[PDB]
Amino acid sequence: MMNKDSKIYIAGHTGLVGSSILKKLQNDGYENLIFRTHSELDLTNQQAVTDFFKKEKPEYVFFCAAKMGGMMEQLERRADFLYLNLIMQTFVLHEAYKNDCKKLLYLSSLCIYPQDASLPIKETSMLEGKLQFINEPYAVAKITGNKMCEFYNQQFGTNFITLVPTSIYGPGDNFNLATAHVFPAIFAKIYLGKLLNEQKHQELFNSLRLDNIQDVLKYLSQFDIDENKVTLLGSGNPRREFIYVDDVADACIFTMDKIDASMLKKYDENFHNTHLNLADGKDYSIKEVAFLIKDIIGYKGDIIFDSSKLDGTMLKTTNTERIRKLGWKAKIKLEDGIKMMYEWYLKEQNIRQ
Amino acid sequence: HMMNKDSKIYIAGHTGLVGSSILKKLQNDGYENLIFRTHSELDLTNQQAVTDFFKKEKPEYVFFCAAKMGGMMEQLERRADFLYLNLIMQTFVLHEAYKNDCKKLLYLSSLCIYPQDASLPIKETSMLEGKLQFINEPYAVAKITGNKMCEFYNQQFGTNFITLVPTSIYGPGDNFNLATAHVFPAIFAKIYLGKLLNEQKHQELFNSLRLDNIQDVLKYLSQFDIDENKVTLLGSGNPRREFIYVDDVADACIFTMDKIDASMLKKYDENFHNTHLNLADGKDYSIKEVAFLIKDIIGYKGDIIFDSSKLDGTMLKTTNTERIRKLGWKAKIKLEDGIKMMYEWYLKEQNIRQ
Ligand SMILES: NC(=O)C1=CN([C@@H]2O[C@H](COP(=O)(O)OP(=O)(O)OC[C@H]3O[C@@H](n4cnc5c(N)ncnc54)[C@H](OP(=O)(O)O)[C@@H]3O)[C@@H](O)[C@H]2O)C=CC1
Ligand SMILES: NC(=O)C1=CN([C@@H]2O[C@H](COP(=O)(O)OP(=O)(O)OC[C@H]3O[C@@H](n4cnc5c(N)ncnc54)[C@H](OP(=O)(O)O)[C@@H]3O)[C@@H](O)[C@H]2O)C=CC1
Ligand SMILES: Nc1nc2c(ncn2[C@@H]2O[C@H](COP(=O)(O)OP(=O)(O)O)[C@@H](O)[C@H]2O)c(=O)[nH]1
Ligand SMILES: Nc1nc2c(ncn2[C@@H]2O[C@H](COP(=O)(O)OP(=O)(O)O)[C@@H](O)[C@H]2O)c(=O)[nH]1
Numbered sequence: 170m171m172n173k174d175s176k177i178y179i180a181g182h183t184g185l186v187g188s189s190i191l192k193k194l195q196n197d198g199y200e201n202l203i204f205r206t207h208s209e210l211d212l213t214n215q216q217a218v219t220d221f222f223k224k225e226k227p228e229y230v231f232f233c234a235a236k237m238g239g240m241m242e243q244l245e246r247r248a249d250f251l252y253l254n255l256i257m258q259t260f261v262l263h264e265a266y267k268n269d270c271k272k273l274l275y276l277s278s279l280c281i282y283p284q285d286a287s288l289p290i291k292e293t294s295m296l297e298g299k300l301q302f303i304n305e306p307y308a309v310a311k312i313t314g315n316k317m318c319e320f321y322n323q324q325f326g327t328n329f330i331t332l333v334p335t336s337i338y339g340p341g342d343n344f345n346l347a348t349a350h351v352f353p354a355i356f357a358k359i360y361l362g363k364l365l366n367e368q369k370h371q372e373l374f375n376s377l378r379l380d381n382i383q384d385v386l387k388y389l390s391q392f393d394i395d396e397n398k399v400t401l402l403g404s405g406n407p408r409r410e411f412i413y414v415d416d417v418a419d420a421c422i423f424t425m426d427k428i429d430a431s432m433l434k435k436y437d438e439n440f441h442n443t444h445l446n447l448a449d450g451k452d453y454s455i456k457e458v459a460f461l462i463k464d465i466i467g468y469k470g471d472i473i474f475d476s477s478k479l480d481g482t483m484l485k486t487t488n489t490e491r492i493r494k495l496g497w498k499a500k501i502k503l504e505d506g507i508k509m510m511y512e513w514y515l516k517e518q519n520i521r522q
Numbered sequence: 523h524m525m526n527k528d529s530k531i532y533i534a535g536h537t538g539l540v541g542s543s544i545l546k547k548l549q550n551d552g553y554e555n556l557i558f559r560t561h562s563e564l565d566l567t568n569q570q571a572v573t574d575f576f577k578k579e580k581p582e583y584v585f586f587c588a589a590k591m592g593g594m595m596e597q598l599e600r601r602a603d604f605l606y607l608n609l610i611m612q613t614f615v616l617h618e619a620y621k622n623d624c625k626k627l628l629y630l631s632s633l634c635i636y637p638q639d640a641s642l643p644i645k646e647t648s649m650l651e652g653k654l655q656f657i658n659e660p661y662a663v664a665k666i667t668g669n670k671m672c673e674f675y676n677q678q679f680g681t682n683f684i685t686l687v688p689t690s691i692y693g694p695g696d697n698f699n700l701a702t703a704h705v706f707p708a709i710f711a712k713i714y715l716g717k718l719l720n721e722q723k724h725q726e727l728f729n730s731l732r733l734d735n736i737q738d739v740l741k742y743l744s745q746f747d748i749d750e751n752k753v754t755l756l757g758s759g760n761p762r763r764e765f766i767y768v769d770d771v772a773d774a775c776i777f778t779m780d781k782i783d784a785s786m787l788k789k790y791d792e793n794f795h796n797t798h799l800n801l802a803d804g805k806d807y808s809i810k811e812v813a814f815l816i817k818d819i820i821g822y823k824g825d826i827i828f829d830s831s832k833l834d835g836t837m838l839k840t841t842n843t844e845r846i847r848k849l850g851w852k853a854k855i856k857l858e859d860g861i862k863m864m865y866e867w868y869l870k871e872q873n874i875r876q
Contacts, residue, residue, distance in 0.1 A: 215569035215610075247674035248620070255613055255667070256569075263606060297653050302795070309670045313609065316663045320601035441656070 170272075170426050171229055176201045178227035180212060180261055181234030186276060188341040189418035190231050203227060212257040222264035230265045230273040231421055232258060238348040240303055240402070240479060247306050254310035259317065262329065266321055272328040274425050275318050277311045277444055279335060279409075279485055280304035289486040292333070293442045303481045319440040328429045331444035332420060335487055339414030339506060340513035343521045346392055352411060355401050355459050356507075357522065360514060361389060362399030363468040377522070398471040405456030405474035409485040410448045413501035413509075420447050423497050436491065448487035449499030458503075465507050523780050525553075525583055529625075532557040532581035534566065534615055535588030540630060542695040543772035544585050557581055561588075566611040576618035584619045584627040585775055586612060592702045594657055594756070594835060601660050608664035613671065616683060620675055626682040628779050629672050631665045631798055633689060633763075633839055634658035643840040646687070647796045657835050673794040682783045685798035686774060689841055693768030693860060694867035697875045700746055706765055709755050709813050710864065711876070712746060716753035717822040719743060731876070752825035759810030759828035763839040764802045767860035770853040774801050777851050790845065802841035803853030812857075819861050 171177060177194060181187040182204035194202055203225055210221050212234050236253040243250060258275065265273045282290050283298030295315060300308045318329035338352035346357060364373045365385070373385045386395070393400035424445070433443040453461075459472050501509070514520070525531060531548060535541040536558035548556055557579050564575055566588050590607040597604060612629070619627045636644050637652025649669060654662045672683035692706035700711055718727045719739070727739045740749070747754030778799065787797040807815075813826050855863070868874065 246678060248671070248678040251667075251671055251674050252613065252617060255609065255671075259606065259609060259613075266602075296650075299651050302793070305670065306674050309667055313605075313663055313667050316659065317602070317605055317609075320605050320660050324600065324602040439656070 170429075171199070171422075173198060174200045175228045175271075176203060176225065177229040177231070178225065179204045179231045179233060180257075181232070183207070184233055184235070185337060185339065185342045185414055186417055186421070187231065187233030189339070189414045190233065190421055193415070193418050193422060212261060213253060215256070215260050218260035218264050222268045226268045226270075227265070228271045229425055230261065230270050231425070232261050232273060232275050234261070235276075237307060237350075238343070239350045239354060240481065242348045243303055243307060244479070250306040251310050254307065255313060258310070258314045262314070262317055262321065265329075266325055266327055270327075272330060272425055272429065273318075274421050275314055275329060275331045276421070277315050277331050277333040278307060279333060279487065280308040281311045281315060281333065281444075284482055288484065289488040290446070291488045292436070292444050292446055292491065295442050295444070301481050303479065315444050319443065322430050322433065322440045322443075326430065330424055330428050330433070332417075332424055332447045332492075333444050333487075334417050334420075334447040335410040335412050335449075335485070337412055337414055337417050339510050340517070341414060341521075345522050351402075351455055352458065355455065356462055356510065356514075358392060358394060358399050358401060359459065359462045359468050359472070360466060360511075362394050362470055363466055365389060365394065365396045366468065366470045368396075376520070393473070393475060396470075398473050399468070400473045400475050401455065401459055402475060402478040403455065403480040404476045405459065406454055407480050407483050408452040408454045410450055410452055410487055411458070411503060411506075412447065412449050412499065413506035416449060416499040416501050417447065419500065420492065420497050423495075424492075427495060445491045445495075446487045446489050447492055448489050450503060452484065452486050453503070461503070462507060465504065466511055525776075525780055527552055528554050529583055530555045530557060530579065530581045531583045531585070532579065533585045533587060534558075535586070537561070538587055538589070539691060539693065539696045539768050540771050540775070541585070541587030543693070543768045544587065544775055547769070547772050547776060566614060567607060569610075569614055572614035572618050573621075576622040580622050581619075582625045583779055584615065584624050585779070586615050586627060586629050588615070589630075591661060591704075592697075593704045593708055594833060596702045597657055597661065598833075605660040605664050608661060609667060612664070612668045616668070616671055616675060619683070620679055620681055624681075626684060626779055626783065627672075628775050629668055629683060629685045630775075631669050631685050631687045632661065633687060633841065634662040635665045635669060635687065635798075638836055642838065643842040644800070645842045646790070646798050646800055646845065649796050649798070655836050657833070669798050673797065676784050676787065676794045676797075680784065684778055684782045684787070686771075686778055686801045686846075687798050687841075688771050688774075688801040689764040689766050689803075689839070691766055691768050691771050693864050694871070695768065695875075696864075699876050705756075705809060706812065709809065710816055710861070710868075712748060712753050712755060713813065713816045713822050713826070714820060714865075714868065715743060716748050716824050717820055719748065719750050720822065720824040722750075730874075747827070747829060750824075752827055753822070754827045754829050755809065755813055756829055756832040757809065757834040758830050759813060760808055761834050761837050762806040762808050763836075764804055764806055764841055765812070765857065765860075766801065766803050766853065767855035767863070770803060770855050771801065773854065774846065774851050777849075778846075781849060799845045799849075800841045800843050801846055801851075802843045804857065806838065806840050807857070815857065816861060819858065820865055
């Protein structure tokens, strides 16, 4: 349905997901792709989004802009992670409607779901129970975004489509040890632990943008990482699914080509909980993932789990019957995704950290 | 009693039912630095206008009484509008109140935040614990997000953003538009116009509805199955809920602003979780009980009929008020007196919202 010459806007194109969607549409030869850096268009400025949408009137919108961070950043920035994401999504979704966009893809998150939802989690569990405390700010932004799509679809006849991915990983992520989500954090922690263990001082200098090992050792000691051990957060017991960034990009494009409002009414004629879960593969513990990374990248040191730090939800699995029956499948297995991310990590000179 | 007579006090939505009652009380009590703007003067849906206003006026206390709302049938149509307009108004006001170092803000919420199957009487801790009433979802989502935004600002920034969750309100200054009004003003206005028609008070009907002749008045009212013999209301009349008079809400808002701060909310929950305060007075009444009481008070001679072919929604709502009761708040106005005060105002007022 998206034509080669359709005006396609990718919001948050510099991010993990947005960069993968933009790269794929560029590779696949789409002719009319529009995007703006945060510097060029601040999506927290109501009038700037109004002006952009009125000038450009994109036919398709992939909403990939967000301000997020891992568990510890979420426990600090309670106001910021509600506020910034509420306004960005509300201005983009509203102006996409006011300027007669054909379809919009809203990216949501598993934190919409109740902590004690029956497993595997069904899309119909949204708003049926108490949230995970850690995630409440972002969860409330995402629930509100999901419901906003439903209400625009119902009142205005829009095609505002929601995909709810599991935790994502791959090239282009935020690997800042303090602010990263679990997968990029533990990958970056184990990788730096490996360079230290193997006395690869120059790679550590180049990777961390530091000049001497006193500064490297001091930076890494903050995370209880030394030449012998890499310490990770919590018990390592929480279990969840992971999905490779290029599979999410593929699913977003697939959904934008193939789903409309009329198809959502087959799930619920009032658009109630008509988002689609997006997941691939089994659940893994954080400890299993850590040990898999350690094997793949050849780390010889110890992985210790500092159980003095928080775990939240101990088990997440996702019902993916809606998107499976629509015909989507993942291409990238966890071992291959780790290898692709490692290959990229070894060569990228502008890593987010 | 911590707002001073000279405190800079902003009442957002000052022309509405709650806002007008708070402004009138503070004017009458001699507060000297009251700040307010009409919707025309300050559109709270414009981010930059809200920023400009807060930067200029730097209010110390904010009463957030602005909203775009409507009864059950308007809510079933305006799914997008009732989320969008309220989400952006509250987000801009709460954020700019933080950015401009307000002392305290009072956020008004609504019982639709609660699960349809919440255990009764409803406790504040039931918010986000279960499925909402479908009819109310758009406004309910705006209100849940507002309640949570006050919690998050309180936790991250040490603000004093305080939330009251009133039951259905009634009184002078309401929206009495027969199609868009909430249940209490709707049934009052329907019964009152039914009374005038039953009593052949054609001139009062022309004055009230701004129509020229009885044919026009009869066409308009026949939309609601109101005629010279009877008044038709929506549903079975069996749904039950609490009602609170507008001036009791105004008094509770002022009491809350004088008496609660963040330190006090932490006594309910150290992380501000579900630390809004329910606001209710009195027993649950059926819509039929309120309709019959209005009939009795205004002396309507006609029949009241409940059109069962229309929706009832949630069948019973009662509220746990232990928090606000332990703080020392009490309602002053009983239902019969509130109806009489509303009727007295209705028979005088030249600019009723209809
Ligand atoms: N990563 C994951 O594990 C998961 C992600 N998702 C969802 O996918 C979406 C994309 O996430 P992800 O790609 O990981 O996020 P990223 O942090 O990688 O990317 C965020 C993007 O938003 C941009 N942005 C942030 N603030 C603004 C602003 N004020 N104006 C304009 N642009 C802005 C960032 O640019 P800049 O950096 O220059 O500010 C960047 O382009 C989100 O909705 C997220 O919740 C869902 C499931 C899991
Ligand atoms: N009434 C009830 O039964 C209940 C009310 N509450 C809550 O109390 C609060 C006040 O409700 P209530 O007094 O009944 O509401 P009203 O509809 O009576 O008043 C709404 C006010 O907001 C103003 N307003 C609307 N849109 C804008 C805008 N874009 N910019 C600026 N001002 C605007 C209106 O002005 P104008 O008319 O000129 O547009 C008016 O001053 C709400 O949060 C409501 O949910 C809670 C419990 C029940
Ligand atoms: N952010 C992060 N989480 C980690 C790390 N090591 C383990 N975890 C665990 O992963 C979970 C947090 O995941 P994260 O992506 O931060 O947050 P979430 O997706 O919102 O749950 C917690 O159990 C942490 O204890 C790490 O280095 N960083
Ligand atoms: N709006 C309205 N509701 C009515 C009327 N008569 C009865 N009701 C009942 O009042 C309830 C709707 O209340 P309303 O204030 O519109 O919405 P809510 O407070 O969001 O539930 C339902 O139980 C209706 O059946 C009427 O004339 N108008």
